[PDB]
Amino acid sequence: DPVEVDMGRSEENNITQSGGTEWSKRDKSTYDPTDDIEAYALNASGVV
Amino acid sequence: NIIVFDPKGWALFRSFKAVKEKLDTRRGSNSELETAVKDLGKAVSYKGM
């Protein structure tokens, strides 16, 4: 029987990429990936 | 002798090509700086000099 488990995680985590910031349509040879990384990691409750 | 950057502002300031070049020149400057990912979790983080 279908039984699920959901330990409470807010929607702000597990971020998907939509519209812009696709990391594919974005220019290589001029974009640094660090900016997204720093922003994504902002939601982590503790050091990573 | 100290500058406080909000993370978006620091990302904007780091995006420039020339400010990266101030670190890579052999004799241009003496700017030790960690322009990569560092200290993601904590609040205050020191980025070189």
UniProtKB/Swiss-Prot annotation, chain A:
Subcellular locations according to the entry: Virion; Host cytoplasm
Organism superkingdom: Viruses
Protein role: Assembles to form an icosahedral capsid with a T=7 symmetry. The icosahedral capsid is about 60 nm in diameter and composed of 415 major capsid proteins. The assembly is primed by the interaction between capsid assembly protease and portal dodecamer, and major capsid proteins assemble cooperatively to form the procapsid with the help of capsid scaffolding protein. Major capsid protein forms hexons and pentons of the icosahedron. Viral genomic DNA is packaged into the procapsid through the portal vertex.
Assembly behavior: Homomultimer. Interacts with FI protein.
Family as reported in the entry's similarity comment: Belongs to the lambda phage major capsid protein family.
Protein name (record): Major capsid protein
Gene from which this protein is expressed: E
Entire-sequence positions represented here: 148 to 195 of 341
